[PDB]
Swiss-Prot record:
It is a single-pass membrane protein. It is found in: Sarcoplasmic reticulum membrane; Endoplasmic reticulum membrane. Reversibly inhibits the activity of ATP2A1/SERCA1 and ATP2A2/SERCA2 in sarcoplasmic reticulum by decreasing the apparent affinity of the ATPase for Ca(2+). Also inhibits the activity of ATP2A3/SERCA3. Modulates calcium re-uptake during muscle relaxation and plays an important role in calcium homeostasis in muscle. Required for muscle-based, non-shivering thermogenesis. Residues 1-7 are cytoplasmic. The keyword Transmembrane helix applies. Signal peptide: none annotated. This is Sarcolipin. Homooligomer. Can also form heterooligomers with other sarcoplasmic/endoplasmic reticulum calcium ATPase (SERCA) regulators ARLN, ERLN, PLN and STRIT1/DWORF. Monomer. Interacts with calcium ATPase ATP2A1/SERCA1. Interacts as a monomer with ATP2A2/SERCA2; the interaction decreases ATP2A2 Ca(2+) affinity. Interacts with VMP1; VMP1 competes with PLN and SLN to prevent them from forming an inhibitory complex with ATP2A2. One of its GO terms (molecular function) is ATPase binding. The chain crosses the membrane at residues 8-26. One of its GO terms (biological process) is calcium ion transport. Keywords: Endoplasmic reticulum, Membrane, Sarcoplasmic reticulum, Transmembrane, Transmembrane helix.
Amino acid sequence: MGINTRELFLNFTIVLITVILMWLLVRSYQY
């Protein structure tokens, strides 16, 4: 982790797109 931004979005941005799609994309409207 040195001189290379956007290198941890996977865990972060996924847990965020997963959390969201969950509360609402799991209900009855997939992504």
